[PDB]
Amino acid sequence: MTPPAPVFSFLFDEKCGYNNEHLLLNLKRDRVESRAGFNLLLAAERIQVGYYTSLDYIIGDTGITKGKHFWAFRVEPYSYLVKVGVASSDKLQEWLRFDSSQPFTLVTIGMQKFFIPKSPTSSNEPENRVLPMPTSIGIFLDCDKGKVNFYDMDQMKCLYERQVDCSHTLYPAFALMGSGGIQLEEPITAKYLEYQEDMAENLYFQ
C-alpha cells in the first residue's frame, strides 16, 4: 500500500499557543517558517557571542484518537534544526509555554540530513545514524498497533519505526529552531480534483 493508510487532512493550529515571535504561518496555514524575529534583530548589536534560541513547537489542528493515519511534508533543505512526529496533549504543555508507554516521538532534520534517533531490537545489519533528507517525508500513525513509521517518499522506504502510546489523543507535532521551514503536502489525487473544479467553474469565453 503506497501510502500505507488513508491521507489525514489538517493545517497548522494558529490557536495552539505557538511562539509567533519566531514562527510565521503562511496565508493557508499549510507552511510554517522559523525566523529570528524583530526583537532579536533590532537588538543584534547586543549579540557578540551568541543567544539562547528556543525550540518552538507547533501542532496540527486535528487530533487522532484511533485508526491508521498518513501525512507528508517537505522540510527546507537549509533548515538549522527541525523535529517532526507526534505528541499527546500531556507532552505538549511541557513544550508549549519501553518505547510503547512513551506518548510522543520525534525525528530530527537539519543540514539537509535525516537523523535516526536510535536502532534497538534489530541487529540484522549496521544501519546509518545519518541519511540524506528526503525532499518529501511521510508519517504513518497506527493507533491499533501503537506504532509510528517515518518514510522517505522519494524512495518509498521506511527510515524509522517506533512503538508509541496511543491511549490519549495524538497530534501531528513539529518544532523549529534557527531558520527553517515545513510545508504540508497534499496527495496528487487532491490536485487532479482541484483541476476538475477549476475547469468546471472558471473556464470562460473571451
Residue numbers in the entry: 506 to 602, 627 to 735
Paper text:
TRIM family members typically contain a RING domain usually catalyzing ubiquitin transfer; one or two B-box domains mediating protein–protein interactions; and a large coiled-coil domain region, which is involved in self-association or oligomerization with other TRIM E3-ligase proteins. About two-thirds of human TRIM proteins feature a PRYSPRY domain, also known as the B30.2 domain, in their C-terminal region. All characterized family members shared the same overall PRYSPRY twisted β-sandwich fold consisting of a 7-stranded and a 6-stranded antiparallel β-sheet.
The crystal lattice of the TRIM36 PRYSPRY domain contained four molecules in the asymmetric unit, forming two essentially identical symmetrical dimers. This observation is consistent with the TRIM36 domain eluting in gel filtration with a Superdex-75 column at a retention time corresponding to a dimer. The dimer interface is formed by a helix-turn-strand insertion between the canonical β-strands 2 and 3 of the PRY subdomain. The total dimer interface area is 1803 Å2 for chains A and B, and 1875 Å2 for chains C and D. The same PRYSPRY dimer interface was also predicted in the AlphaFold3 model of the full-length protein of TRIM36, and the related TRIM46 homolog, in addition to the typical dimerization via the coiled-coil domain. An unusually large insertion was observed between the canonical β-strands 5 and 6, featuring an additional helix and a long disordered segment. A systematic analysis of this canonical substrate-binding region in the PRYSPRY structures determined in this study revealed significant variations and distinct surface properties across different family members, providing intriguing insights into the divergent evolution of TRIM family members. This canonical binding site was accessible to a varying degree in the domains crystallized here, except for TRIM36. In this case, dimerization via the insertion between the canonical β-strands 2 and 3 effectively occluded much of the putative substrate-binding site.
